[PDB]
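Repro case for the chain-ordering regression, as requested:
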Amino acid sequence: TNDNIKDLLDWYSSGSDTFTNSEVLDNSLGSMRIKNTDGSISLIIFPSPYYSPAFTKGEKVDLNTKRTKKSQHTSEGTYIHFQISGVTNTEKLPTPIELPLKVKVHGKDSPLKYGPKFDKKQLAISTLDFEIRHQLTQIHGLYRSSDKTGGYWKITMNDGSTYQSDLSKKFEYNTEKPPINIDEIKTIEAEING
Amino acid sequence: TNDNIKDLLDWYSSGSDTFTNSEVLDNSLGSMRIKNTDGSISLIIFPSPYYSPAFTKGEKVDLNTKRTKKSQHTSEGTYIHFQISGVTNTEKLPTPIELPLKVKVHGKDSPLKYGPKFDKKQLAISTLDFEIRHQLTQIHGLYRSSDKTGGYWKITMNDGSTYQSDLSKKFEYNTEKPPINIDEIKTIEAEING
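-- result from build under test --
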């Protein structure tokens, strides 16, 4: 594969951070300072004009986010994470739901018809992106060979509205739309090509 | 949490690398040089006296492994990964199997009774460790608060033999036993405490 595809493989196989019921310390309207219940602090940026959380100091939030650079300890010993997007409310569903991924690879529908499970009412579109693409890389070989370097995912809501991303490029954080209610997702489909 | 627990959370939420049908370039008996089908090269160490793959040049292997330090590009442009353990044969099962995790948290059995799915015949014990603990961190809060900082996982085989790890410490790579046939795992259980 070429270097940009290796960069995509690195990003989508580098894990993510999940924190629940973190506390907002400061919201600078495009960036947030948040205290996680393990004592770490997350500094999270929101580059999109369409998704800029407004939660104020003291409110609780959930994080399902990616790091942009290595976490560092301060002189006082506080651990600081540097993240992007992935901040939602703390509302939970009574039991988890699965978001099965319907996947086509080189025009052939895969028999693997499962997906990640979540008990949160709302997820950021970027979170859905990394969960989807992580499954595509791990299970379907996305970015692991020259024949699996592009395609798309598409979410269709119960009301017919859609969200989509091009697998040949990094997720479009700069135009990310606001988080969605996952219980109202109708289907998630993806196709891998090359 | 204390810093060693934050280190564990970092390790178990930093992702992993999955490659299939990679080619052995060199086996130095305790370390291997492997060419992945994306063109990258993996340099993998095997510190255990009990798990030291013997695959020779030209043989095919699978990788389900963790990086020990950042990947680097050489002057010729080759991307090099630095990994530990996680090398198996390429044998596949006809359909994937699930390795459900039975989880107890603070003495209470969790209702979440699912696990990761694999279509490989064999997995290294370290791979099982990171898959198990990743699920424990993400879904059950392991390492995310002072009340969830220890416990164990235990694999029981159909023949009654067992494998186990202490969640309060890093996986014991230095004494890792050889890979196991996952179709003969009877149960995987874990308990989280603090």
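Ordering looks correct now. The longest strand of chain B covers residues 60-73.
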